[PDB]
Design a protein around this ligand. Sequence first.
Ligand SMILES: Nc1nc(=O)c2ncn([C@@H]3O[C@H](COC(=O)NCCc4c[nH]c5ccccc45)[C@@H](O)[C@H]3O)c2[nH]1
Ligand SMILES: [Cl-]
Ligand SMILES: [Cl-]
Lengths: 115, 110
Amino acid sequence: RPGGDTIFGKIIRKEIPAKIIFEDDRCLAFHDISPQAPTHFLVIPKKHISQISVAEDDDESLLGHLMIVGKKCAADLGLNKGYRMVVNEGSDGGQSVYHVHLHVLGGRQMHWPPG
Amino acid sequence: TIFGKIIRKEIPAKIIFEDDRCLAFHDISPQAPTHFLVIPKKHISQISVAEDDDESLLGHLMIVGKKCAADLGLNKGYRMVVNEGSDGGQSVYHVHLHVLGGRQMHWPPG
Ligand SMILES: Nc1nc(=O)c2ncn([C@@H]3O[C@H](COC(=O)NCCc4c[nH]c5ccccc45)[C@@H](O)[C@H]3O)c2[nH]1
Ligand SMILES: [Cl-]
Ligand SMILES: [Cl-]
């Protein structure tokens, strides 16, 4: 099954519902089910990559596409005061779904340090 | 910006890696045992103004970032962060990727 069987691969294949912001041939943007900000969504590749630590050199454009889509969706969602983009890697980074995903959070003042 | 001075080697920074299109160096106010930045040499002021033909460059920052993290021993994981604007807490208007690890990172991420 293309994209794998994590919750994210199932969302890609429309097997589990999600609230979809934007979709193209390379990625999917949808809202997070447990938001940590007034606006909190995810941008994920449709290609399954388990984590950024195993991304290949040829995934450069796909990862860059994740951030460009992230900043376009943020603008379309009216996050004009700013937002924060987060990729987590592994146990210390806080990763709980092993499919590469970009968090985009906004609608409030984000604090420092970022966790 | 001060990051421009760092790229031009006009002020010192503890450089981790450099190529023809980006620079990685330790952050001067670290928030984790390992905290570095990956910045492009092109002056993109902020992610919100990045163009579509910057997708390869922005992705290059992340691949460099994950390669430096491995080289710096972050085998238990790390967090990558890009801030935009006042709500995102962006501190310097030259786009930069934060990489933090060496300790458990918490949720929410700020
Ligand atoms: N729309 C949607 N549908 C789902 O079924 C679903 N299942 C999980 N998720 C979202 O994926 C995201 C998973 O991304 C992460 O791994 N982020 C870190 C959260 C986290 C889990 N454990 C941690 C430990 C330390 C620090 C952070 C964490 C979460 O925000 C979660 O709400 C979902 N989102
Ligand atoms: Cl600059
Ligand atoms: Cl910043």
